[PDB]
Ligand binder design. Structure first.
Ligand SMILES: CC1(c2ccc(Cl)c(Cl)c2)C(=O)NC(=S)NC1=O
Length: 134
């Protein structure tokens, strides 16, 4: 009975576009870009009361965030950035802003047909990562 019901579940990466260029823009170094770009993560989303948990599991890294919408938290990203994150729901889209070293990136997650579409933006550079139910 929402929040976020249509996001909850276990999702597997099925396509990616422009992720190397997005990672370059973020500042990810060569070796991490190569290994991270190979990964085929599973994204596991769950909700318990007001707390949303998003796990990413791959051969590269396992990460986990738990958060309340609108409430800032500290996140260590898969590429080892120490960021301050805030996630909100905007018109049915989860909007995740990460701030670090005067920089910012925004990750949007939305349901489109049977997919979960993730759009990662850093300045002018967008990467689109498509997940399907596992
Ligand atoms: C693990 C992952 C990510 C995101 C940004 C960077 Cl920069 C890196 Cl290295 C890895 C990913 O591979 N794909 C998605 S959609 N979410 C993530 O949390």
């Amino acid at each position: 009975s929402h929040m976020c019901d249509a996001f909850v579940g276990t999702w597997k990466l099925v396509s990616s576009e422009n992720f190397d260029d997005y990672m370059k823009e973020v500042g990810v170094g060569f070796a991490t870009r190569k290994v991270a770009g190979m990964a085929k993560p599973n994204m596991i989303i769950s909700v318990n009361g007001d707390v949303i948990t998003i796990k990413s599991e791959s051969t590269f890294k396992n990460t986990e965030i738990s958060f309340i919408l609108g409430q800032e938290f500290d996140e260590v990203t898969a590429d080892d950035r120490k960021v301050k994150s805030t996630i909100t729901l905007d018109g049915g889209v989860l909007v995740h802003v990460q701030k670090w070293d005067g920089k910012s990136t925004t990750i949007k997650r939305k349901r489109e047909d049977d997919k979960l579409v993730v759009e990662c933006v850093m300045k002018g550079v967008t990467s689109t990562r498509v997940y399907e139910r596992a």
